[PDB]
Design a protein around this ligand. Structure first.
Ligand SMILES: O=P(O)(O)C(O)(Cc1cccc(-c2cccc(NS(=O)(=O)c3cccc(S(=O)(=O)Nc4cccc(-c5cccc(CC(O)(P(=O)(O)O)P(=O)(O)O)c5)c4)c3)c2)c1)P(=O)(O)O
Lengths: 222, 219
């Protein structure tokens, strides 16, 4: 609370570059990255942060189906730990085209942790900022079609109620590791007023001290 | 190849205080900085320049009228196409007409398109487009699950121009402050502590250089 930062969003990037520098393969960077993910989640939960939203940045249509398989399979194991640390898990992104199986796992993972009182962790999977806005627009569009919503009655607050994470504290700080200075279609609507923090540190090397630096930079900025 | 630059001009007031002067002084200097940035963009092949004045109200409008009346003939002469983006429905009829006439007069120019955000907000921009799509739904000429990214994109401001490539924010603050949101999904973001009145050609080129290098890297 001292940092006054309630919601932190992170574009994780640099795992491949990190591995390359050491003459190592992708698997090595991914392994290092997952470790950094756990470290960041634990840090947030132990530092009074209300919400952490993670986005794995990566530079096909057959590959995605395979990635989400890995995603969900990895999730099933992580959920136990998350639940154990009192974390509330939520998956944001277009999960509509996921097969009903791995789509039920996600659903159960969320149901299982919904009642926790610790950190709320949002993991982006097949997520897009524009997509997020659009799916929210379709919802309002349905209500227009059903006759109980006039086009001209639509305002910002209304649309805000239909975008991902509307129930949570607004995003206060966005962190992007890896050196690139862009949002890359991650959160858009939700970062209208967020502090943007760019660091050249590669995701695998981003540790607790780096996270603290970002929070300190945030606190001193206003 | 930087085609569209958007700028969050900030720091006029702070600049004034640093000089131990009144706010009005910062404004005056800020105005010169605007003329300088526009000239620089128009002289270097930039396709579009979008300006947003960040602020830490009737007279405001009279100033707008005056700026339009004194600068549009020069913009037209320089082959600059002027556009005002934002909610101008609340403006008095005189200002709205000046804006409409200014755009009409320069609409046919083929040089730099200068976009001035007036009473503009990124969320408002998106919402105004959503309301346009909601109208066609109500008319039954559009299905809810028929709305997609491409469709909404065609209804947000500047959809007819090249995509925003670079967003520059002066003044030291590291936020978008509800300026462009949908349009900056893939843009390079550049923050400088330089105060707007001090932002000159060298600072602008520096951002362009940063853009070029970062394009070679990351893609
Ligand atoms: O852009 P990079 O270099 O930082 C990258 O490493 C991608 C990346 C960026 C930021 C974070 C992570 C990441 C890495 C490991 C774990 C986690 N935790 S997660 O909850 O966020 C998550 C877990 C499972 C999947 C996903 S994802 O589908 O949203 N992202 C993603 C994108 C690209 C590659 C991978 C990936 C992750 C782990 C393992 C693999 C597979 C293998 O590559 P590997 O065995 O060599 O490791 P492969 O089975 O084919 O041989 C691939 C994963 C995310 C996140 C991965 P890249 O070279 O793959 O594009």
């Amino acid at each position: 609370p001292a940092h006054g930062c309630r919601h932190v969003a992170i574009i994780m990037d640099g795992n491949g570059r990190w591995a390359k520098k050491q003459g190592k393969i992708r698997a090595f960077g991914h392994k290092a990255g997952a470790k950094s993910v756990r470290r960041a989640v634990s840090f947030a939960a132990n530092n009074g942060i209300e919400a952490l939203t993670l986005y794995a940045f990566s530079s096909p249509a057959q590959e995605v189906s395979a990635l989400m398989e890995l995603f969900v399979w990895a999730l099933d194991s992580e959920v136990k730990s998350l639940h154990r640390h009192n974390v509330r898990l939520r998956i944001i992104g277009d999960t509509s085209r996921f097969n009903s199986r791995l789509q039920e796992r996600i659903r159960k993972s969320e149901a299982l942790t919904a009642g926790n009182t610790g950190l709320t962790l949002n993991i982006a999977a097949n997520y897009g900022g524009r997509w997020d806005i659009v799916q929210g627009v379709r919802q309002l569009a349905e209500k227009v079609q059903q006759g109980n919503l006039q086009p001209d009655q639509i305002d910002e607050e209304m649309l805000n109620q239909h975008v991902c994470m509307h129930e949570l504290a607004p995003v206060d700080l966005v962190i992007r590791t890896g050196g690139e200075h862009r949002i890359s279609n991650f959160l858009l609507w939700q970062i209208a007023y967020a502090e943007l923090y760019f660091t050249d540190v590669l995701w695998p090397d981003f540790d607790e001290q780096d996270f603290e630096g970002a929070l300190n930079a945030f606190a001193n900025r206003e």
